[PDB]
């Protein structure tokens, strides 16, 4: 059992002068992303989009344009610094969707509450020939 | 003291504030162009835009065209500017038909730079866009006619 | 902070043990090959020192000794040129009759039929005509006998040995400490004042004591064997005084500031000597003297051990403003840390310099009998253009390697760099737009002219006879240069260059040297082509640098390295996102730009400059002044330039120029060969190789080093390398056959 | 010494020696028997 | 003769080519003092030219209307020197090279690091093996019969 | 605050940067002039048809009635027809 | 969205998950190998199709497969 931490607005954002690498209309009408982390101090870190920003001591909130930017920055926060991070997807309705770490456990560490998806129980060479799924909507790897 | 700041204070919206972008001269001038008159009927803004542009297009067509050196028809080469007004008005029309449906509301922003709620421009509606296209056509044909009406006492006729 | 000599003793042991361990420098490569890919990596990583080790001191020591190796090779190469000038040249016969004899410094053996390449170059000499220019240098240096060339070749060989020795010595015996390299103020002070200053002064010395007098006897028609030896001018000052009377004073006017009395052999006349067609040697010696003073002064700007002077860090930090923040703060730390940064700036400036040299040497021919030798002049201009362009693309490559490898805002921060990175999208978007605008409004005008000319409407073209696009600004400039002497340069007798000033056509041996170069709509259109091509090259390379770290498509791009093929077919496909692939793409555009530049040079010079002159002064240009009316159209380039001027190289068979015909076709071949690599991909080749490998295992002859197709990156590198070699060598053969036959 | 012979056994060096010998040989053969479209000795 | 050609000894065009070549080299020769070294070189090229055309004429080469040798590769016994005989020589040498290289690869294949001897040649082993190519046709024929030439089930 | 899950238009920068929002600087009588005269062109489908058919027939007109003093293609050849390489 | 599948040749070395730049893959418990874990692709709607996972797999043949399929804003890696 794991309860995703809710996104807390009014969480401070890093010190940064602005860049052309930030959000666009996509964030207004489609979706954007938010990564939060806890920092032990004020540090300089490389922004996945602009140049250099100053991570604030304590909780940090950072809105990014793509999920991959959140995961890249988080990978670095966990690597260069030793910082726990989470990030979420945010729709223009205000709805928030917690994304990562999905279990509260990082996905490279096996966690027992996890259900198999897209797992085929056979060697890859035992997939059927296309002719055997022709005119059916299926793909030989969907089995 | 530094001249460049993030856009509207938010440093993670992808842009910057410069003398080019946010300046009283620039902000006033852009705010006083017809396209940026959000409360005005789009038909009138289309009239102004069409008048300016249609008037402008006459020059290059007449002076650079193929009949330019036959002053008998070279002056009358303004028909080409008229035709370009027709084509552009087609492009506007199909842009609005493609972009806006009958009962959809405006897609323009309904906020101001300072955060207060705004009423969105009707230009970004099907009816508002149709009105802006009709106005651009009328003003454009009219501006071409007005430029062609003046052939006299100009250093480059 | 006390600058001093710092080295370490015996850091690396001189041994053949690692000669026998291929890839010793790399921990992975040293394990030897499991596949053929190993063999390529061994060569691609050999000089990538900062990938071998992370210790800045070791890297700096490798770099230093490597530079010694380079200089050794250069001295061996100069030894070759002087030795061939002494032993296998017609340089004395040419020295007698320069306007007739063709310079030749290579002779081929009669083995397989190739002796036909030993052609009639004059002076009773069979050989290959040389376009390097060494004869005009040696004449300008007062060199007369082959013996002097022998002595120079021996000295050059000795210096090759000394440089090589110093490389081994400073890598294996006395290897400087890292602080020694980072003493930037000392280095700049010694290269400004010591290297450039004392070099220029020494050369001024040789010129006033050797070059000027010996060239006076050459110009006066004296036989070179009868000319006094250069040291006889140093001993008996009466020889010089007869030639140059000022030498009777004993350098007393120098100390008494009577320097105007030296206006005899130190002059500001400018223009060209009408006998030799080269710049006045008095002006040149005076020039090297002035340069010597300027650099000797410039070498005292930086503080070292005596408190006076500048620290460069101070200068940087003081320079900041309301637009750039704290800018320049941090650059001293970057430029004393990253070799790739220094190599980037130095490649940029050295290549740009080489291009400037290319212009200044044609418009101001510095050596005697150089301007009228059109093969040498075309060869020099084209050559230095290529060197410059290559060097600049290199500057982009190493700016990118800095961004990927040495950039760290948490350690060595710079405000200017951060701000640039913070509006890279604006910079690249605007450069993109300018490139499109320039494409349309330079090349699209050519297409306009081709279409109007095909439709029978030459009055609707862009031409000096139709719709004129006059380069009014450049015309005004060259007018101002023409009016400069006596007005804004009262000391200057004539124009700065004969391309400016009207009249004063210079002819040598019936051939013209320089006359005023006209400018019109054709020159306008071509110049905007050059603007266009340069802007697109800059776009590709700068875009490569600024998005090497990251982008909206790939946020973690810097973790993939400087040189990587892609990040896969996803995100729509991400091939060629690496900064390396931006250098790859920019090489093609440097080729395009420089190609159009040298075509513009050959075309314009043969049309409006070079040619023969009548006894009564009627000039016939090699081509009929057809630049103005034929270059304003792409069909005119295809027909009146390529199709016309390629006749020599396709007609060279059966003559001594047939080697240029063979290289014409062969360079076409390697260029087309590159398209196999550039248009395909290694998956196909690896599968095919699977079948070939099957065939070998069938006969027990499959190799242990498993055959592999080239890497994606290597496919690209091979491709661009053969594309560039083929194109450049094709234009090489074309140019040399053309200008050797018709020049 | 052993390491130097090893270095001289490496692929590029052995290749230059081998092809340089082959080139001298073929050159001298074309020097004593030049031209020759055929094997004339039958 | 064959294919409508004529022997080069009987070809007017062939002799016209020899004449025009020699007169060309002599036109170059008129420029230099006869004692000079360029002169001796052009004389050597002239003698080599005469040797060339005289040899092509002697050894029975047929000529086209172009006055140039054409090679008969059909196998006609009058022209084996033009292909079949140099061809057998070639196949002997190429078979030698490939047989020796195969011998080397087989010899090093069970070494502890085979690739090590592929990038650094075992010159003693190579010298031991080079002269196996002298008898490569007997060796390869015997291997083909014995079943040692081709790998089994590949 | 710059992040508010309640107002994302402010949060995502969805503003009218240069929109004036002021009232009409166009005086009336001018406005009513253009409103009554440009009104038939404010139906987008109808305007599309009027532009395609109007401009198309206009084009057909100036093309059908063009004079050789304007187009060489109507003027036709004015020279004696030349003779082909071997043929007519 | 791109399809991503795991095959029971998987040995549970976790390298596909470690390589993934959009967090598509997880490690779930399983009894078929010694590491007692097998990969899984529960979030392929975020899959961009770069095949870093496939570059990371040590199994011969692969035990992750990315079948590039219907493109979306997320699969094209668009920040706009
Ligand atoms: C004279 C004897 C000698 C000996 C035995 C050694 C021994 C050694 N050196 Mg040293 N060194 C020497 C001279 C020598 N060096 C000289 C003269 C220089 C000045 C250039 C250096 C500078 C130097 C540096 C900077 C480094 C070494 C390194 C090394 C070690 C690595 C092994 C190696 O170098 O393989 C190399 C084998 C080669 C055959 C290299 C050939 C390179 C030549 C000079 C290029 C020739 C250019 C060529 C003509 C281009 C035309 C090509 C064309 C035909 C297509 C090794 C123990 C490296 C080290 O420390 O290892 C960690 C290291 O980085 N040496
Ligand atoms: C394949 C069909 C086609 C046709 C029939 C034409 C016809 C014409 N072209 Mg065009 N052109 C074409 C393709 C075509 N072009 C393409 C593909 C390109 C891109 C390379 C161009 C680019 C091109 C250029 C750059 C120019 C022309 C010009 C011309 C005119 C030159 C003759 C003239 O001087 O007349 C008479 C000259 C006049 C100025 C009379 C104007 C004609 C009136 C305005 C017709 C009214 C138009 C109509 C209302 C709207 C049309 C759209 C319609 C479907 C709704 C001529 C009427 C020239 C031109 O138009 O001059 C400005 C010229 O500048 N063409
Ligand atoms: C190569 C493009 C081009 C060409 C051929 C012309 C040609 C012409 N223009 Mg135009 N103009 C252009 C670009 C061009 N213009 C641009 C980019 C703008 C800004 C949008 C203008 C805005 C402009 C205005 C406002 C006016 C003209 C006017 C004129 C006409 C007479 C004025 C003149 O040129 O004398 C010399 C002009 C000087 C300013 C001096 C002339 C036929 C005038 C006109 O149409 O008369 C009724 C007029 O009032 N032009
Ligand atoms: C007046 C003193 C002086 C002079 C003349 C030079 C000259 C040169 N330096 Mg050096 N250098 C100096 C002082 C000097 N340096 C100082 C104070 C520092 C900082 C401590 C450096 C550190 C430095 C580095 C890191 C490098 C150079 C390099 C070079 C060469 C650049 C390429 C070139 O121009 O080739 C032109 C060729 C010539 C002019 C031929 C003449 C060269 C003669 C033989 C050397 C004369 C100066 C020499 C230092 C005297 C010492 C010899 C003695 C100790 C036995 C060049 C020969 C590059 C290099 O090493 O290339 C191998 C390079 O990498 N310099
Ligand atoms: C003094 C200038 C200079 C210096 C010192 C360097 C130094 C370096 N460069 Mg740079 N670069 C330069 C100029 C320079 N470069 C220029 C002018 C360009 C434009 C082409 C580049 C573009 C560039 C790229 C794209 C890359 C580098 C890389 C590197 C590093 C690896 C070098 C290596 O081991 O390759 C080994 C050398 C070879 C394998 C030789 C290859 C043979 C060439 C391709 C053919 C030459 C043809 C020949 C001249 C004509 C035909 C003869 C033939 C028929 C026999 C190294 C530190 C690489 C790197 O990874 O950086 C870390 C890299 O990717 N450079
Ligand atoms: C002749 C071949 C060719 C052509 C036409 C182009 C064209 C272009 N390249 Mg490319 N390139 C080429 C070869 C070519 N390239 C090759 C072989 C490579 C591999 C190394 C590259 C790699 C390359 C890179 C890496 C880049 C470019 C860029 C560009 C653009 C430069 C901006 C510009 O000039 O816009 C204007 C367009 C032109 C000058 C083309 C001709 C325009 C005609 C004359 C106008 C006709 C219009 C007419 C109305 C047509 C309508 C007819 C109707 C029927 C549709 C341009 C469109 C740069 C870029 O993206 O742009 C900034 C860029 O970064 N190229
Ligand atoms: C507009 C550009 C321009 C350029 C590039 C030059 C260039 C030159 N001028 Mg000059 N000059 C100019 C304008 C220009 N001038 C004008 C408009 C006038 C008035 C008509 C003069 C009058 C003038 C005189 C009287 C002299 C020169 C001289 C010179 C030459 C030596 C420079 C010098 O005196 O050191 C620098 C002089 C200084 C006072 C220090 C100023 C520092 C500068 C900015 C660096 C030089 C090539 C000298 C000459 O004839 O050389 C042979 C000389 O005696 N000029
Ligand atoms: C597969 C293509 C091919 C073939 C079949 C040939 C064939 C031939 N060439 Mg050519 N050539 C080629 C490609 C080819 N060449 C290429 C690509 C080039 C450019 C590099 C040349 C450039 C070239 C030149 C310049 C010359 C030839 C010559 C010759 C002839 C020399 C015969 C000889 O050496 O005497 C006999 C040699 C031997 C018997 C050696 C084998 C003996 C071995 C070493 C030992 C055997 C021990 C038992 C021969 C018929 C020469 C000639 O005179 O033409 C008539 C000559 O002048 N070739
Ligand atoms: C050279 C002319 C450029 C003038 C820049 C004007 C100029 O020098 O302004 C200088 C301006 C002042 O910066 P600061 O006062 O902060 O500088 C102080 C420190 O940086 C130096 O100590 O810098 C900028 O404005 C940032 C650059 C933005 C401008 C980008 C525009 C680029 C377009 C240029 C290309 C068009 C012309 C090309 C012709 C070659
Ligand atoms: C042709 C081609 C190949 C095949 C080309 C290869 C494998 C080049 C290697 C061929 C050389 C000849 C192998 C070297 C063999 C050794 C030097 C041994 C030679 C023996 C003696 C003669 C020295 C690719 O691998 C490739 C990869 C990616 C994009 C395009 C292409 C591509 O176009
Ligand atoms: S085709 Fe090659 S370069 Fe392109 S994405 Fe695929 S692997 Fe990368
Ligand atoms: S293709 Fe890329 S994004 Fe998709 S699952 Fe594999 S590593 Fe993750
Ligand atoms: S890389 Fe292959 S074996 Fe390893 S966890 Fe992923 S699917 Fe399993």
Question: Regarding beta strands A119-120 and G3-7, do their DSSP bridges make them parallel or antiparallel, or are they unpaired?
Answer: parallel
CB burial of A33-62 (b: ≥16 within 10 Å; e: otherwise) equals bbbbbebeeebebbbbbbbbbebbeeebbb
DSSP state of F5: S
Is E74 assigned a ligand-binding role in the annotation?
A: yes
**Count of all residues that appear for chain F in the document:** 88
Radius of gyration of chain E from Cα atoms? 25
Resolution value (Å, 1 decimal): 2.6
Pocket mutation for ligand 13, best pick of G63, G65, G66 (most atoms within 8 Å of C-beta): G63
The answer to whether C631 and C462 are in contact (CB under 8 A) is no
Q: How far apart are CA G58 and CA C321, in angstroms?
A: 55
CB contact under 8 A, B69 and C459: yes
Of A5, C323, C464, nearest to B5 by C-alpha is: C323
Return the ∠ at Cα C284 (arms to C281 and C287), rounded to 5°. 155
Q: How far apart are CA A18 and CA A24, in angstroms?
A: 13
Domains for chain D: give ranges and CATH numbers: 1-42 (1.20.5.510)
Helix (H) or strand (E) holding G40: strand G37-40
3-state secondary structure E27-96: HHHCCCCCCCHHHHHHHHHHHHHHHHHHHHHHCCCEECCCCCEECCCCCCHHHHHHCHHHHHHHHHHHHH
Return the ∠ at Cα B126 (arms to B120 and B128), rounded to 5°. 55
Surface-to-core class of residue E144, CB atoms within 10 Å of its CB (0-12 exposed, 13-18 middle, 19+ buried): exposed
Half-sphere exposure for C184 (CA within 13 Å, toward CB): 14
Q: How was this structure determined?
A: X-ray
**Count of all residues that appear for chain B in the document:** 157
CB contact under 8 A, E59 and D34: no
3-state secondary structure A42-87: CEEEECCCCCEEEECCEEEEEEECCHHHHHHHHHHHHHCCCCCEEE
DSSP state of E9: G
Residue nearest to atom 62 of ligand 6 (CA): C432
Q: How far apart are CA B117 and CA F10, in angstroms?
A: 10
CB burial of C243-265 (b: ≥16 within 10 Å; e: otherwise) equals bbebbeeeeeeeeeeeeeebeeb
Write out the residue range of the structural domain in which residue F86 sits: 1-88
How is residue C128 written in tokens?
Answer: 């290959």
Beta bridge partner(s), residue A37:
A60, A85
> Which chain A residues touch B15 with a CB distance below 8 Å?
18, 20, 22
Half-sphere exposure for C32 (CA within 13 Å, toward CB): 15
Cis peptide before B12 (omega within 30 of 0): no
Q: How far apart are CA C484 and CA C268, in angstroms?
A: 13
Residue nearest to atom 19 of ligand 8 (CA): C662
> Which chain F residues touch B113 with a CB distance below 8 Å?
15-17
What is the Å distance from ligand 7's center to B22 Cα? 44
Of G46, G43, G38, nearest to G64 by C-alpha is: G38
Beta bridge partner(s), residue C612:
C511, C620
Class of domain B1-157: mainly alpha
Beta bridge partner(s), residue B13:
A23
Return the ∠ at Cα C491 (arms to C488 and C493), rounded to 5°. 95
The CB density around residue F12, as the number of other CB atoms within 10 Å, is 24
Helix, strand, or coil (residue C190): helix
CB contact under 8 A, D38 and E119: no
Pocket mutation for ligand 8, best pick of C108, C110, C112 (most atoms within 8 Å of C-beta): C112
Write out the residue range of the structural domain in which residue A45 sits: 1-143
Domain boundaries, chain C: 1-743
Class of domain E1-154: mainly alpha
Considering its fold, how many domains does chain F have in total? 1
Q: How far apart are CA C718 and CA G63, in angstroms?
A: 34
How is residue G72 written in tokens?
Answer: 């979306």
Of C423, C433, C428, nearest to C582 by C-alpha is: C428
Q: What contacts B86, CB < 8 A, 6 or more positions away? A: B137, F51, F54, F55, F58
The answer to whether A86 and A70 are in contact (CB under 8 A) is no
CB contact under 8 A, F47 and B130: yes
Cis peptide before A101 (omega within 30 of 0): yes
CB contact under 8 A, C552 and A18: no
Half-sphere exposure for C143 (CA within 13 Å, toward CB): 22
Write the DSSP string, C400-446. HHIIIII-BTTTB--HHHHHHHHTHHHHHHHHHHHHHHHIIIIIHHH
What is the least distance, in Å, from the CA of B112 to any CA of chain F?
Answer: 5
What is the Å distance from ligand 8's center to E37 Cα? 29
Q: How far apart are CA C648 and CA C660, in angstroms?
A: 9
> CATH number, domain at G49?
3.30.70.20
CA E117 to chain centre: 31
The answer to whether C546 and C424 are in contact (CB under 8 A) is yes
The answer to whether F11 and A96 are in contact (CB under 8 A) is no
Q: How far apart are CA A141 and CA G38, in angstroms?
A: 17
Q: How far apart are CA C98 and CA C371, in angstroms?
A: 12
Write the DSSP string, C111-154. SSSGGGGSEE-STT-EEEEP-S-HHHHHHHTT--SHHHHHHHHH
Beta bridge partner(s), residue G65:
G5
The answer to whether E72 and E82 are in contact (CB under 8 A) is yes
Kindly state if the Cβ of C260 falls inside 6 Å of ligand 1.
no
Question: Among all residues of chain F, which has the CA nearest to that of B66?
Answer: F70
Domain boundaries, chain B: 1-157
Q: What contacts G29, CB < 8 A, 6 or more positions away? A: A110, A112, A114, G36, G37, G38
Kindly state if the Cβ of C162 falls inside 6 Å of ligand 1.
no
Write the DSSP string, C662-695. HHHHHHHHHHHHHHHHHH--HHHHHHHHHHHHHH
DSSP state of C20: S
Strands (E), C140-224: 174-176
Considering its fold, how many domains does chain A have in total? 1
The end-to-end CA distance of chain G, in Å, is 18
The CB density around residue C442, as the number of other CB atoms within 10 Å, is 19
Of C401, C719, C395, C682, nearest to C566 by C-alpha is: C682
Binding-site annotation, residues of C for [4Fe-4S] cluster = 566, 575
Q: How far apart are CA C36 and CA C512, in angstroms?
A: 57
Categorise residue F32: left if φ over 0, alpha if ψ from -120 to 50, beta otherwise. Answer: alpha
Beta bridge partner(s), residue A43:
A55
Write the DSSP string, C615-655. TT--EEESS-STHHHHTTSHHHIIIIIIIHHTHHHHT-TTS
The CB density around residue C93, as the number of other CB atoms within 10 Å, is 18
The answer to whether A36 and A7 are in contact (CB under 8 A) is yes
The CB density around residue B71, as the number of other CB atoms within 10 Å, is 12
Q: How far apart are CA B111 and CA B131, in angstroms?
A: 24
Tokens 């120029």 -> residue: C657
D3 reaches C (C-beta below 8 A):
yes
What architecture is domain C1-743? Up-down Bundle (1.20)
Surface-to-core class of residue G63, CB atoms within 10 Å of its CB (0-12 exposed, 13-18 middle, 19+ buried): buried
The answer to whether C574 and C554 are in contact (CB under 8 A) is yes
Q: How far apart are CA B64 and CA B74, in angstroms?
A: 9
């Amino acid at each position: 059992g794991f309860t995703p931490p809710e996104l807390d607005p009014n969480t401070p954002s890093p010190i940064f002068g602005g860049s052309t690498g930030g959000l666009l209309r996509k964030a207004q009408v489609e979706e954007f992303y938010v990564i939060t982390w806890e920092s032990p101090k004020e540090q300089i870190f490389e922004m996945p989009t602009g140049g250099a920003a100053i991570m604030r001591e304590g909780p940090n909130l950072l809105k990014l344009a793509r999920k991959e930017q959140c995961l890249a920055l988080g990978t670095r926060l966990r690597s260069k610094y030793k910082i726990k991070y989470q990030f979420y997807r945010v729709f223009p309705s205000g709805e928030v969707q917690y994304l990562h770490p999905k279990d509260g456990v990082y996905p490279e560490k096996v966690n027992p509450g996890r259900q198999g998806v897209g797992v085929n129980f056979r060697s890859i060479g035992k997939n059927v020939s296309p002719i055997e799924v022709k005119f059916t909507g299926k793909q030989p790897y969907d089995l | 003291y530094q001249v460049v700041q993030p856009i509207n204070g938010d440093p993670f919206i992808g842009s910057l504030e410069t003398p080019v972008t946010s300046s009283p001269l620039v902000a006033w001038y852009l705010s006083n162009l017809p396209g940026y008159r959000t409360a005005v009927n789009p038909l009138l803004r289309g009239i102004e835009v069409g008048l300016a542009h249609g008037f402008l297009l006459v020059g290059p067509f007449v002076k650079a065209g193929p009949l330019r050196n036959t002053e008998i028809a070279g002056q009358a080469g303004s028909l080409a500017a008229g035709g370009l007004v027709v084509i552009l008005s087609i492009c506007l029309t199909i842009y609005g038909i493609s972009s806006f449906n009958e009962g959809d509301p405006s897609t323009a922003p309904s906020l101001t730079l300072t955060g207060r709620k705004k009423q969105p421009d009707q230009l970004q509606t099907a009816d508002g866009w149709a009105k802006f296209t009709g106005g651009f056509f009328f003003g454009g044909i009219s501006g071409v006619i007005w430029a062609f009406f003046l052939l006299y006492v100009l250093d480059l006729p | 902070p006390e600058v001093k000599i710092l080295v370490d003793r015996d850091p690396i042991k001189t041994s053949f043990e690692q000669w026998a361990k291929p890839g010793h420098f790399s921990r992975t490569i040293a394990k030897g090959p499991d596949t053929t890919t190993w063999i390529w990596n061994l060569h691609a990583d050999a000089h990538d020192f900062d990938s071998h080790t992370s210790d800045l001191e070791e890297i700096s020591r490798k770099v230093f000794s490597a530079h010694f190796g380079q200089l050794s090779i250069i001295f061996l190469w100069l030894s070759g040129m002087y030795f061939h000038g002494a032993r296998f040249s017609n340089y004395e016969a040419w020295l007698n009759d320069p306007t007739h004899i063709r310079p030749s410094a290579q002779v081929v053996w009669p083995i397989v039929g190739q002796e036909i390449l030993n052609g009639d170059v004059g002076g009773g000499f069979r050989g290959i005509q040389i376009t390097s220019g060494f004869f005009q240098i040696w004449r300008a240096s007062g060199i007369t006998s082959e013996l002097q060339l022998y002595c120079t070749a021996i000295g050059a060989l000795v210096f090759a040995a000394l440089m090589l020795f110093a490389g081994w010595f400073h890598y294996h015996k006395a290897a400087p400490k890292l602080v020694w390299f980072q003493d930037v103020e000392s280095m700049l002070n010694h290269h400004l004042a010591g290297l450039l200053g004392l070099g220029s002064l020494s050369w001024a010395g040789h010129q006033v004591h050797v070059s000027l007098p010996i060239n006076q006897f050459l110009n006066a028609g004296v036989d070179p064997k009868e000319i006094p030896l250069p040291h006889e001018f140093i001993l008996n000052r009466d020889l010089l005084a007869q030639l140059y009377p000022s030498f009777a004073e004993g350098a007393t006017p120098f100390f008494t500031l009577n320097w105007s009395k030296y206006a005899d052999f130190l002059t500001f006349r400018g223009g060209l000597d009408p006998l030799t067609g080269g710049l006045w040697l008095t002006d040149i010696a005076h020039h090297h003297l002035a340069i010597a003073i300027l650099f000797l002064i410039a070498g005292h700007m930086y503080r070292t051990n005596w408190g006076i002077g500048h620290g460069i860090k101070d200068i940087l930090e003081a320079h900041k403003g309301p637009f750039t923040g704290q800018g320049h703060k941090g650059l001293y730390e970057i430029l004393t840390t990253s070799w790739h940064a220094q190599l980037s700036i130095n490649l940029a400036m050295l290549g740009s310099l080489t291009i400037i040299v290319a212009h200044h040497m044609y418009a101001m021919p510095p050596y005697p009998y150089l301007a009228t030798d059109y093969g040498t002049q075309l060869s020099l201009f084209t050559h230095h253009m290529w060197i410059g362009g290559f060097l600049i693309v290199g500057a982009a490559a190493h700016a990118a390697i800095f961004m990927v490898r040495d950039y760290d805002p948490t350690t060595r921060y710079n405000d200017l760099l951060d701000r640039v990175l913070r509006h890279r999208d604006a910079i690249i978007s605007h450069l993109n737009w300018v490139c499109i605008f320039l494409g349309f409004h330079s090349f699209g005008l050519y297409i306009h002219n081709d279409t109007m000319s095909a439709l029978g409407r030459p009055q609707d073209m862009f031409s000096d006879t139709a719709i004129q696009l006059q380069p009014v600004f450049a015309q005004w400039i060259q007018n101002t240069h023409a009016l400069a002497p006596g007005t804004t340069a009262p000391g200057a007798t004539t124009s700065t260059s004969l391309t400016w000033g009207g009249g004063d056509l210079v002819s040598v041996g019936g051939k013209v040297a320089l006359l005023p170069i006209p400018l019109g709509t054709a020159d306008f259109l071509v110049h905007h082509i050059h603007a266009f091509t340069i802007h697109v090259t800059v776009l590709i390379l700068l875009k490569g640098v600024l998005f090497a770290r990251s982008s909206r498509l790939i946020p973690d791009k810097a973790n993939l390295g400087f040189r990587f093929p892609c990040d896969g077919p996803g995100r729509g496909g991400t091939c060629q996102v690496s900064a390396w692939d931006h250098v790859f793409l920019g090489l093609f555009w440097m080729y395009n730009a420089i190609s159009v530049v040298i075509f513009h040079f050959s075309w314009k010079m043969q049309s409006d400059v070079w040619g023969s002159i009548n006894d009564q002064g009627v000039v016939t240009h090699i081509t009929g002044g057809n630049f103005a009316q034929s270059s304003i159209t792409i069909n005119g380039w295809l027909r009146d330039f390529l199709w016309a001027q390629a006749s020599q190289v396709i007609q060279s068979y059966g003559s001594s120029l047939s080697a240029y015909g063979l290289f014409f076709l062969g360079a076409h071949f390697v260029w087309a060969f590159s398209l196999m690599f550039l248009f395909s991909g290694r998956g196909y080749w690896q599968e095919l190789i699977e079948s070939i490998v099957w065939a070998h295992n069938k006969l027990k002859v499959a190799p242990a080093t498993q055959p592999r197709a080239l890497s994606i990156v290597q496919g690209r590198a091979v491709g661009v390398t053969h594309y560039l070699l083929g194109g450049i060598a094709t234009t090489w053969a074309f140019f040399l056959a053309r200008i050797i036959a018709v020049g | 010494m052993r390491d130097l012979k090893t270095y001289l056994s490496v692929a590029p060096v052995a290749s230059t020696l081998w092809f340089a010998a082959l080139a001298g040989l073929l050159i001298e053969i074309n020097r004593f028997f030049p031209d020759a479209l055929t094997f004339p000795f039958f | 003769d064959i294919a409508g050609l004529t022997p080069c000894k009987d070809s007017k065009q062939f002799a016209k080519r020899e004449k025009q070549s020699i007169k060309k080299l002599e036109s170059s020769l008129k420029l230099y003092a006869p004692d000079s070294a360029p002169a001796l070189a052009i004389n050597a090229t002239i003698e080599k030219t005469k040797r060339r055309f005289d040899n092509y004429g002697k050894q029975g080469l047929l000529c086209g209307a172009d006055g140039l040798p054409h090679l008969i590769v059909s196998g006609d016994q009058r022209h084996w020197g033009e292909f079949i005989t140099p061809g057998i020589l070639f196949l002997y040498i190429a078979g030698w090279i490939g047989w020796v290289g195969r011998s080397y690869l087989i010899a090093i294949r069970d070494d502890k690091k085979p690739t090590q001897k592929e990038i650094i040649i075992d010159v003693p082993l190579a010298t031991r093996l080079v002269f196996r190519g002298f008898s490569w046709p007997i060796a390869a024929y015997r291997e083909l019969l014995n079943g040692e030439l081709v790998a089994k089930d590949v | 605050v710059y992040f508010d899950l309640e107002d994302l238009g402010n949060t995502t920068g969805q503003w009218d940067l240069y929109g004036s929002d002021a009232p009409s600087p166009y005086n009336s009588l001018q406005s009513k002039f253009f409103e009554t005269f440009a009104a038939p062109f404010t139906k987008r489908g109808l305007l599309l048809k009027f532009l395609i058919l109007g401009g198309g027939s206009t084009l057909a007109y100036f093309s059908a009635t063009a004079s050789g003093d304007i187009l060489p293609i109507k003027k036709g050849p004015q020279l004696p027809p030349q003779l082909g390489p071997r043929l007519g | 969205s791109h399809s991503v599948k795991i095959y029971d040749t998987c040995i549970g070395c976790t390298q596909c998950v470690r390589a993934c730049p959009t967090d598509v893959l997880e490690m779930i418990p399983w009894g078929g190998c010694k590491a007692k874990q097998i990969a899984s692709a529960p979030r392929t709607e975020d899959c961009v199709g770069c095949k870093r996972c496939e570059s990371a797999c040590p199994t011969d043949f692969l035990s992750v497969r990315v079948y590039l399929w219907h493109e979306t804003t997320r699969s094209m890696g668009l920040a706009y």
